[PDB]
Amino acid sequence: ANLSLITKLSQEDGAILFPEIDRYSDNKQIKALTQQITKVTVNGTVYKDLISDSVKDTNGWVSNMTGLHLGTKAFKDGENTIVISSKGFEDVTITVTKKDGQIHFVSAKQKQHVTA
Ligand SMILES: [Br-]
């Protein structure tokens, strides 16, 4: 149901970080997914690749050696839905909760096939 390789986040100033979304990974699936990101949405807002800029307080993302940085501009109280599209991988949906200024990791999945 949940991804094994994306499990956590860090809080930054006006941003969060997914350290496991690593463009330098020896894990070829994580490396190819991260290198080949095509689109990031937060609560349906389209984010811009800021390349190497601070993402503080932006609708912006950066992939670098510390992971995937996301601005919190489009974040809301309660549930937040982050959708990462990539060339070779089904969309990844990360759910995070915001409460009293604090954001925590809830789930990371790709849409699943129903099995018995
Ligand atoms: Br599938």
Q: For residue 86, how many other CB atoms are within 10 A of its CB? A: 17
User: What's the 85 CA to ligand 1 centre distance in angstroms?
Assistant: 14
- The CA angle 33-35-41, to the nearest 5 degrees, is 70
User: What's the 77 CA to ligand 1 centre distance in angstroms?
Assistant: 31
User: What's the 89 CA to ligand 1 centre distance in angstroms?
Assistant: 9
Q: Look up residue 83 and give its two tokens.
A: 């959708």
Pick from 95, 115, 82: which is nearest to 7 by CA?
A: 95
Q: Which residues are annotated as a binding site for heme?
A: 23-24, 65
Expressed as residue numbers, the domain containing 14 is 1-116
Q: How was this structure determined?
A: X-ray
User: What's the 1 CA to ligand 1 centre distance in angstroms?
Assistant: 12
Alpha helix locations (H) across 1-116?
A: 28-35
Beta carbons within 8 Å of 104's beta carbon, 6+ residues apart: 9, 96, 97
Please give the backbone phi and psi of residue 6, each rounded to the nearest 5 degrees, phi first: -120, 110
User: What's the 34 CA to ligand 1 centre distance in angstroms?
Assistant: 19
Total number of domains constituting the chain: 1
Question: Radius of gyration (Cα) for the chain, nearest Å?
Answer: 13
Pairing of strands 60-64, 48-49: parallel
Beta carbons within 8 Å of 101's beta carbon, 6+ residues apart: none
Q: Which residues are annotated as a binding site?
A: 23-24, 65
Per 3-state DSSP, what percentage of the chain is helix, strand, and coil (rounded to 5)? 5, 45, 45
